[PDB]
Each structure stands twice: as structure tokens, then as C-alpha cells.
Amino acid sequence: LPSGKNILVFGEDGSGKTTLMTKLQGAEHGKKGRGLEYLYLSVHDEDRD
Amino acid sequence: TSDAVTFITYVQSLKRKIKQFEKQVELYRNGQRLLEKQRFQFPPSWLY
Amino acid sequence: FYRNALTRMPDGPVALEESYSAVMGIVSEVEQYVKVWLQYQCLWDMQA
């Protein structure tokens, strides 16, 4: 099964990039910090379950 | 015309089996996906 | 509240980077140490 995918992004400081990314997995907000951050995408497929 | 009528009667006989074959396809889709989510080693001779 | 100390770094991003670097020290070894161990699950995929 596919695994190890990765996503990068740039957004200007305080452009809601963290808000969008945290909304993708459903969390209202993560942590607005400095430097590279890290988060998830919990991708579920019912066909492969 | 005998050949044509034989062909058309054969295909109209196939018509009824078309729907049984379609439900066979659907139930086997269900079964194959279930077997995948049961994680069974499909043999090399298995036809996908 | 002050958020500029990273640019105010006396030694530059290196002090940050090395910190971040240690990350894929640890986790990498972790997954490595997991991988071969996780390999044992294959025993079930192979029926008697």
C-alpha cells in the first residue's frame, strides 16, 4: 500500500497556512511557531480499508 | 437466415443470464474486496 | 511579544539546524530498528 508521501508549502508569515493545514485533518488550530513545522494527513481509503 | 436466427436466439438466451452475471460481478467485487481486507494471499494462479 | 531571536542567533541557523538534525537521527534509527522487526508479520501472510 502507498506510504511515505510528503507535502511542502510556503506561506507568508501569518497567512493562515497553519490554519488551512490543521483544518485538512480536522483540528481547529495547531501551533503557530517559528521555523519548519510538522503535521499529519490521516488519509483513509474504504476500498482498501 | 437460419444462421442469423440461431445467432439472435443465442444472444437472447444470453440476455437473461446478463443480469445474473452482473449480480455475480457485484457479489464478487464485494467478496474480493472483503478478502483483500481479510488479507489473504491470492495465489499466483488467481485471475484478477 | 518578541519573535525574532532565531535571526538574532549569534551562531546562525546552525545551532537550530543541528537540533532539528538530531530528529532524523533518533526517528530514523527508530524506524530502522522497527523495520526488520516489523518484517516478522510476513510470517502470517504465508499460510501453511
Curated annotation (Swiss-Prot), chain A:
ATP binds at G11, E12, D13, G14, S15, G16, K17, T18. It is found in: Cytoplasm, Cytoskeleton. Acts as one of several non-catalytic accessory components of the cytoplasmic dynein 1 complex that are thought to be involved in linking dynein to cargos and to adapter proteins that regulate dynein function. Cytoplasmic dynein 1 acts as a motor for the intracellular retrograde motility of vesicles and organelles along microtubules. May play a role in binding dynein to membranous organelles or chromosomes. Belongs to the dynein light intermediate chain family. Homodimer. The cytoplasmic dynein 1 complex consists of two catalytic heavy chains (HCs) and a number of non-catalytic subunits presented by intermediate chains (ICs), light intermediate chains (LICs) and light chains (LCs); the composition seems to vary in respect to the IC, LIC and LC composition. The heavy chain homodimer serves as a scaffold for the probable homodimeric assembly of the respective non-catalytic subunits. The ICs and LICs bind directly to the HC dimer and the LCs assemble on the IC dimer. Interacts with DYNC1H1; DYNC1LI1 and DYNC1LI2 bind mutually exclusive to DYNC1H. This is Cytoplasmic dynein 1 light intermediate chain 2. It comes from Homo sapiens.
UniProtKB/Swiss-Prot annotation, chain B:
It comes from the Eukaryota. It is found in: Cytoplasm, Cytoskeleton. Dynein heavy chains probably consist of an N-terminal stem (which binds cargo and interacts with other dynein components), and the head or motor domain. The motor contains six tandemly-linked AAA domains in the head, which form a ring. A stalk-like structure (formed by two of the coiled coil domains) protrudes between AAA 4 and AAA 5 and terminates in a microtubule-binding site. A seventh domain may also contribute to this ring; it is not clear whether the N-terminus or the C-terminus forms this extra domain. It is linked to Charcot-Marie-Tooth disease, axonal, type 2O: An axonal form of Charcot-Marie-Tooth disease, a disorder of the peripheral nervous system, characterized by progressive weakness and atrophy, initially of the peroneal muscles and later of the distal muscles of the arms. Charcot-Marie-Tooth disease is classified in two main groups on the basis of electrophysiologic properties and histopathology: primary peripheral demyelinating neuropathies (designated CMT1 when they are dominantly inherited) and primary peripheral axonal neuropathies (CMT2). Cytoplasmic dynein 1 acts as a motor for the intracellular retrograde motility of vesicles and organelles along microtubules. Dynein has ATPase activity; the force-producing power stroke is thought to occur on release of ADP. Plays a role in mitotic spindle assembly and metaphase plate congression. Homodimer. The cytoplasmic dynein 1 complex consists of two catalytic heavy chains (HCs) and a number of non-catalytic subunits presented by intermediate chains (ICs), light intermediate chains (LICs) and light chains (LCs); the composition seems to vary in respect to the IC, LIC and LC composition. The heavy chain homodimer serves as a scaffold for the probable homodimeric assembly of the respective non-catalytic subunits. The ICs and LICs bind directly to the HC dimer and dynein LCs assemble on the IC dimer. Interacts with DYNC1LI1; DYNC1LI1 and DYNC1LI2 bind mutually exclusive to DYNC1H1. Belongs to the dynein heavy chain family. This is Cytoplasmic dynein 1 heavy chain 1. It comes from Homo sapiens (Human). The chain holds residues 1163 to 1210 of 4646 of the full protein.
